[PDB]
Amino acid sequence: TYIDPETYEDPNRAVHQFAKELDASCIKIERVIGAGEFGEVCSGRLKLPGKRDVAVAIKTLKVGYTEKQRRDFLCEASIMGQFDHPNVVHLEGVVTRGKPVMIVIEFMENGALDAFLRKHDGQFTVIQLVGMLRGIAAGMRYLADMGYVHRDLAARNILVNSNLVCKVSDFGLPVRWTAPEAIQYRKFTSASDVWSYGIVMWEVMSYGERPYWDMSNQDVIKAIEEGYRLPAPMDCPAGLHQLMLDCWQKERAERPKFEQIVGILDKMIRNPNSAHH
Numbered sequence: 001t002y003i004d005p006e007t008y009e010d011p012n013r014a015v016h017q018f019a020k021e022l023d024a025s026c027i028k029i030e031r032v033i034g035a036g037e038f039g040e041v042c043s044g045r046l047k048l049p050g051k052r053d054v055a056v057a058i059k060t061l062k063v064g065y066t067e068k069q070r071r072d073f074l075c076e077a078s079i080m081g082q083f084d085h086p087n088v089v090h091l092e093g094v095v096t097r098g099k100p101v102m103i104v105i106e107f108m109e110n111g112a113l114d115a116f117l118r119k120h121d122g123q124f125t126v127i128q129l130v131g132m133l134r135g136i137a138a139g140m141r142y143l144a145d146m147g148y149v150h151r152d153l154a155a156r157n158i159l160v161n162s163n164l165v166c167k168v169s170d171f172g173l174p175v176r177w178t179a180p181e182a183i184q185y186r187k188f189t190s191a192s193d194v195w196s197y198g199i200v201m202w203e204v205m206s207y208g209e210r211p212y213w214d215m216s217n218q219d220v221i222k223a224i225e226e227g228y229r230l231p232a233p234m235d236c237p238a239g240l241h242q243l244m245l246d247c248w249q250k251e252r253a254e255r256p257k258f259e260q261i262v263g264i265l266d267k268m269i270r271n272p273n274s275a276h277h
Contacts, residue, residue, distance in 0.1 A: 002147040005078035006173075012096075015074045018081030020093035022046070022104060027095070029058055033111070037172065038062060038073045043107055046092055055107035056092055060100065070101060072172070077103045079171040083146065087139030089159055089169040108159035108167065116160050118208035126237060127272055129204050132166045134265040139168040140197060141258035144190040151188050153177065153196035155203040175217040180224055181252055191252040197261065198247025199230075205240065206233035224248075237275035240268065 005014035026047040034041040039062035045053040061073045080091040080103075090106040110116045113132070117124075124132075136158055143150060150168065154177045157170035179195035181187040199211050211230065212220045229248050232241035243264055249255045256264070268275040 002079075002082055002143075005075055011071050011075060011078070014078040015094060015096055017078070019074075019077040019091060019096075019103075020081075022093040022095055022102075024095050024099035024102075027056075027058065027102065027104060033057065036060075038065075038069060046104060054092065055109075057105045057107050059103040059105065061102065063100070065101065070096075073101070074103070076170075076172040079148070080105070083143070083148075085139055085142040086165070087135045087167050088142060089167045105169075107161075108169075109162040110160035110164070112156050113158040113160050113166060114155035114203055114208040116208075117155070117204060121207040124207075126235065126240075126275060127269060128164075130240070130265055130268050130275070132160075132164070133201055133204055134262060134269065135166040136168065136200060137197065137258055137261045137265060139166075140190075140193060141262055143168065144193065144258050149188050149190055150193050150196070151182075153193050153200060155200050155208065158200065176211045176215075176220050179252065180221075180250070183221065187252075189252070190258070191255050194247050194255045194258065194261070195252075197258070198244045201240070201244045201247065202230050202233065205236040209233070237268075239275045239277050 005011050008014045028044045029042045030044040031042060032040050033043045036059055039060035042058045042060065044056055044058050046056045047053055061070060065073070074094065074096060077091055077094045080089065089108065092104040092106065094104065095102040140150070140153070152170055152174065153168070157168070158166050159169045160166055175183060177196045177199045179192035182192040202211060203209065215223065229245055232238065243261070246256050
């Protein structure tokens with residue numbers, strides 16, 4: 001079960017409990033692949049004993065960090081280290097003292113899902129896109145069952161590997177992805193994650209359009225309050241859009257659970273015609 005590392009009196013102690021310390025000499029930084037909240041994100045490789053090198057992403061904590069930043073940065077590792085599922089990004093380990101501070105994660109060659117789909121706009125069949133959504137739902141089902149509420153589920157936080165497997169990422173600690181009760185009353189639960197999941201479905205079926213396009217945050221909020229919901233994207237079957245609508249139920253208890261979502265998508269894969277009903 002998920003342990004919130006901020007329940008520890010010393011959060012540094014949780015890092016060492018859940019994340020393997022790595023020798024910096026075994027980490028090769030090859031290229032800068034992104035900017036993070038805390039420092040550059042790089043691709044490279046990690047040398048493991050007896051094994052061929054594994055390709056990794058390396059999140060750096062930029063030099064000159066405070067203790068608070070180090071703590072906040074490493075919290076991601078102390079959370080990610082607790083998980084083991086095919087659709088959740090795997091933690092290789094961390095470098096926390098004595099050498100440049102880093103979190104080392106499995107390399108996802110194709111990067112963030114929203115950018116990936118924008119690049120490959122119109123190149124995936126409904127069944128392929130549904131397969132991606134099913135992977136994300138299976139990752140979320142696992143997390144919800146572990147007692148973990150994500151809060152920032154969005155296509156930009158889903159990573160895609162060279163085999164097109166989609167995995168949940170971003171375990172550190174927005175409006176248009178967030179359930180109304182979470183925006184207004186800070187009630188974040190797995191049911192508000194299901195609302196976010198609905199938005200992710202729409203992002204996927206639209207090949208990475210911005211939810212609600214150019215509407216302002218305030219206009220999104222008001223629209224949702226009046227019963228507005230985003231339409232089926234081009235080529236999106238009606239049944240799949242109905243599942244989005246179900247994720248966006250005003251009353252959180254009426255939204256499907258992730259287990260139900262997985263089942264529904266599996267049925268659309270086995271019987272693709274049923275995606276229209």
